[PDB]
Structure 1
């Protein structure tokens, strides 16, 4: 291709086209790790171990063993093992809440005096880092978790880059970039396999399984990218003079939303939809005229491609691929799930293009919307209602029009995720546009760039609190949609840290290069 993509599509197909020795060894090491999760340990040691299993990307292999470990630890009658221990209190608080076992913010009170958190806690970095990490599991009105974040952030930053203990130095720097709660499972696993190997408390059996299982999952990913690349070259959209790296960037995002091998077909369909969202966003933003885009929108609204030949090739090809792929995805729901998803996929595309039109209307009129006007439209235009409603269609038991209507109605859980994805993307922009979060709020309140960014950062923390509380009352939603909704937010944080070199490094270590085994 010209310009060049991150990797050539012929090479990406190369990848998928792990010796039987290793699958057998993997089942063996898996049973040995089950035994370790099950085995009697001191409660702190057990929490540390299952936190390690999670960060290595292995919770999906041990869901039963990890939850049962966590329930056991919540039943442990004597509290002396965590009381007055900042690290143990913090980790317990976090692991309990991550597993739907409530722990009050009051457990942190004893670490404060009249003026706030006790300055002397700065003498224990491991404790500060566990406090920092735990603070992100907090809800609205949990003021002590807000103080904990501010204090632990401030104290860790006063040492970032200058910690003379390699593994804690790396983890502190990594955490201040993004807290574990905000990071993807799959990209964290690759980073943490390296970190873990350098740590004092390393279990070589767990580490050996983490590398083996990483490589096996990666081989499924390599076959998916082969299929997706073949599909993408098949559409001819790799040759559009826009949306360079559209397919690989969508797929890398998808791995953040869902990495598990058993969700391969769903992941491939989400990656196809992301590649089309990126492509068609560029059709609307950096190619089409207002008149071309009116016809694109109208064809989509009516699901009628009669007039498609009035669009030039570079606009007609994206339109008809959106149409053909949406029909294929809808058809999969009929074939696999017994429910024709074409009305649903046609509807979320119509909603999305309507949001683009409103954005373009404002941009042409010169209109300068408020933050709340901007976000009600921009949470649609980012594409996550499309991606998430589609993910629900493809996974809900017994899909129905009424269920799909409900998800597309933005229950608080979904609205939070979509607003978060939009605001996180907007915060990732560097040198400047009246139609992004920061400038809309600047325009509203007469605020500076600095004060407006601080405001938007606060909105990020607030919507995470609602996300967190929604999981303690998941209401009509179940796995895997619960995970999808949170993990698209983590994808956004990871891919919009406030470049192509970083993206290639991430794609190289997670998708292309197996972890070297000493087996």
Structure 2
């Protein structure tokens, strides 16, 4: 009978060739040579764009950067000038690696009246223009016009593209730009698309497949441990909530997939699973009387009065307490800093955000609602925790600063809340206007906050890797998953399908 991705008995069993580990190190070194070897600079950009989209950039970070720096120093410009595909790919890859390119590189493709209508048949160029547009910042208006233009022309030629790989790429891009997609879920999709390309490199393809299955094996061990944990909490047998742990994990794979960040991912997934559960306690099951004991226990970090809550509320509460204590403790053991005050504080702040939302049943300004809704979405919890677990030399002062939610963090948080609200009170709050115009306007705030995030990555930061990646990648996870959160019908089968292709079924090899 069908292996069920929601069945915790099935999930608990995951993580039960050493041959093909050897071939991976060999193909890896072959792929390293390919990235370093001399190519035409366009062929080079396309090669490392390919490495990125196969989910392999984490394996070749030094070689990809040195490659991108080489192309940025290639002194002769004839190779991209007047070539729409090449201008747009060089723009995107350069901005992606923090090398500034001006929106003026797109001047030869437009005039005072805008982009030439003669570009409607350059599909590859239209698609590369489209993808590059989302690397733009606020006030970069040529980039804004490029998007609206490439979007219209691509929509018109859809279904009239002879190249199999190119037709698939256009359809995929118009649903979500590459810039908004997760690395790991994109990687599984692109392995299939790349294999149909004219210029496919069989050594890169073979290595893409082998690395993906090796990484997948790491994830399966993670899901087993997390499922055993979840069943050990008894929260899988709770009413009021849905999948919880497995959905939280699928998200966390969007936030971070690298085997070397496994422990942090598992903890993020746990916190994710508790946020969905307690959100439902506060937004559907708990009564007023119950939420104030729960909040109050959390504020004081004192479980003396826990036994005054009923089972179905007491269990979420004590699991939050015990997990927050465990993650705080991990910081002390591994990072030399007791993180319990930090985890207790992000839970106390998150419960207050939930307590304002429930008092309001008042009708706030979109500004007032987002001020609170960027906390209740639980990405301050998740991101402050991810920073506690990874920053070099954590201190109280550094944790007070990230928890103050400066722009870079605040922009990720608002983006997560807004993408969540687009995927069913952001629309209601804004709307003396209609739903259609409120939606369109929120979609606008998405575009705007992404420009703010993009620019932040160029701007002086106290932040480093991996937290920089965590803060952008939560938004991508939000883009990819919130579209399909309904829990039934088409959204459930698409989610199950992503789950099964990325977490369960390996890629057939040679």
User: What range is the shorter-chain TM-score in?
Assistant: over 0.9
Tell me: CA distance 1:314–1:393, structure 2 relative to 1, closer, same or farther (3 Å).
same
Paired residues for 1:39-58 under 5 Å: 39-58=37-56
Evaluate the alpha carbon distance shift between residue 5 and residue 235 of structure 1 in structure 2; reply closer, same or farther with a 3 A threshold.
farther
* Conserved 8 A contact 1:352-1:380: yes
Match of 1:3 in 2: 2
Shift of 1:427: 0.6
Moved more, 413-422 or 165-174: 165-174
Shift of 1:22: 0.4
CA distance in 2: counterparts of 1:428 and 1:20, whole angstroms: 43
Shift, 1:242, TM fit: 2.5
Are the aligned partners of 1:55 and 1:188 in contact in 2 as well (CA < 8 Å)? yes
* Secondary structure of the corresponding residue to residue 71 of structure 2: helix
Alignment length, in residue pairs? 503
Q: Relative to 1, partners in 2 of residues 1:314 and 1:5: Cα closer, same or farther, differing over 3 Å? A: farther
TM-score with structure 2 setting the length: 0.97
Could you tell me how far apart the structure 2 residues matched to 1:279 and 1:448 are?
A: 33
Contact persistence 2:5–2:500 (CA under 8 A): no
Q: Which of the residues 85, 92, 107 maps onto 1:94?
A: 92
Whole-Å separation in 1 of the counterparts to 2:339 and 2:205: 42
Give the equivalent residue in structure 2 for 1:413. Answer: 408
Conserved? CA contact 1:5–1:245, under 8 Å:
no
Aligned to 1:175: 173
Return closer, same or farther for 1:78/1:343 CA change in 2, 3 Å cut-off.
Answer: same
Q: Distance in 1 between matches of 2:328 and 2:501?
A: 34
Show CA shifts across 1:342-372 (max 9, x none). 0000000000000001000111xxx111100
Shift of the alpha carbon at 1:106?
0.5
Q: Deviations over 1:401-449 (max 9, x none)?
A: 00000000011000000000000011111xxxxxx1111110xxx1111
Alpha-carbon distance, 1:6 to partner: 3.6
Instruction: List per-residue Cα deviations over 1:211-258 (Å, max 9, x = no partner).
Output: 000000000000000000000000010000122210000000000000
SS in structure 2 of the partner of residue 471 of structure 1: helix
CA distance in 2, matches of 1:115, 1:428: 36
The answer to whether the 8 A contact 1:333-1:339 is kept is: yes
- CA distance in 1 between partners of 2:245 and 2:367 (Å): 32
Pairing of 1:251-330 with structure 2 (within 5 A): 251-330=249-328
Rounded Cα–Cα distance in structure 2 between residues aligned with 1:33 and 1:4: 36
Check conservation: 2:328, 2:340, Cα contact below 8 A: yes
Q: Distance in 2 between matches of 1:454 and 1:165?
A: 33
Distance 1:388 1:3 in 2: 36
| Alignment partners' CA distance in 1, 2:108 and 2:45 | 21
* Distance in 2 between residues matched to 1:26 and 1:474, nearest whole Å: 38
Match of 2:430 among 426, 430, 441: 441
In 2 relative to 1, CA 61–474 (structure 1 residues): closer, same or farther, beyond 3 Å? farther
Aligned in 2, Cα 1:201/1:252: closer, same or farther, shift over 3 Å? same
Give the deviation of 1:168 after TM superposition. Answer: 1.1
In structure 2, C-alpha distance between the alignment counterparts of 1:45 and 1:265, rounded to whole Å: 38
The alpha-carbon deviation at position 7 of structure 1 amounts to 2.9
Q: Which moved more, 1:65-74 or 1:104-113?
A: 104-113
- Across the aligned residues of Structure 1 and Structure 2, the Cα RMSD in angstroms comes to 1.4
SS in 2 for 1:488: helix
Check whether the contact 2:353–2:372 (CA below 8 A) recurs between aligned residues: yes
Runs of 5+ unmatched residues, structure 2: 484-490
Which of structure 1's runs of 4+ aligned residues deviate more than 4 A?
2-5
SS at match of 2:392: coil
CA distance in 1, matches of 2:132, 2:460: 21
Q: Deviations over 1:459-510 (max 9, x none)?
A: 001000010000002410000000000000000000022x110110000000
Q: Is the 8 A contact 1:161 1:173 kept in 2?
A: no
**CA drift at 1:4:** 12
Give the conservation status (yes or no) of the 8 Å contact 2:44–2:67: yes
**Which stretch of the first structure deviates more once superposed, 452-461 or 165-174?**
165-174
**What is the Cα deviation at residue 160 of structure 1?**
2.6
Separation in structure 2 between the aligned mates of residue 97 and residue 342 of structure 1, nearest angstrom: 38
Tell me, in whole angstroms, the C-alpha distance in 2 between the residues paired with 1:324 and 1:73: 51
Say yes or no: does 1:375 pair with 2:392: no
